[PDB]
C-alpha cells in the first residue's frame, strides 16, 4: 500500500505511489514533501541501484518496505 524512503539525514518519509508510475514518481512525491528537486536526490534498495523507466513495483519496491535515499552535499 505504502513505502518508506529514508533520507541520508536519517529522517523517515512514508510515501505512496502507483505500482507503474515509475521510480520517477517516488522522487516526485518527495519533491513536494522535502522540497528537494530531482537530480539532487538518488534512490536505492539495500544497495541495489534503482532506475526510472521501469515499473517500480516489479523492480524492488515492496509493501511497506524500506528504501534508501541520497541527497546533495551542503556545499560548505
What does this molecule look like?
With 76 residues, the chain is of the alpha+beta class. The chain is built from two helices and five strands; from the N terminus they run E-E-H-E-E-H-E. It has one domain (1-76). Helices cover 17% and strands 25% of the residues. It starts with a strand and ends in a 6-residue tail after the last strand. The modification (Microbial infection) ADP-ribosylthreonine is found at residue 66.
Helix and strand arrangement:
Blueprint: E1 3-6, E2 12-15, H1 23-31, E3 42-45, E4 48-49, H2 56-59, E5 66-70
Parallel strand pairs: 1-5
Antiparallel strand pairs: 1-2, 3-4, 3-5
In short:
It is classed as cytosolic protein. The entry lists the keywords regulatory protein, ubiquitination, cytosolic protein. The chain is α+β, with helices and mostly antiparallel strands and about 80 residues long.
Amino acid at each position: 500500500m505504502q513505502i518508506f524512503v529514508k533520507t541520508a539525514t536519517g529522517k523517515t518519509i512514508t510515501l505512496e505511489v502507483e505500482p507503474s508510475d515509475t521510480i520517477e514518481n517516488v522522487k516526485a512525491k518527495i519533491q513536494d514533501k522535502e522540497g528537494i528537486p530531482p537530480d539532487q536526490q538518488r534512490l536505492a534498495f539495500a544497495g541495489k541501484q534503482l532506475e526510472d523507466g521501469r515499473t517500480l513495483s516489479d523492480y524492488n519496491i515492496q509493501k511497506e518496505s524500506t528504501l534508501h535515499l541520497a541527497l546533495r552535499l551542503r556545499g560548505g
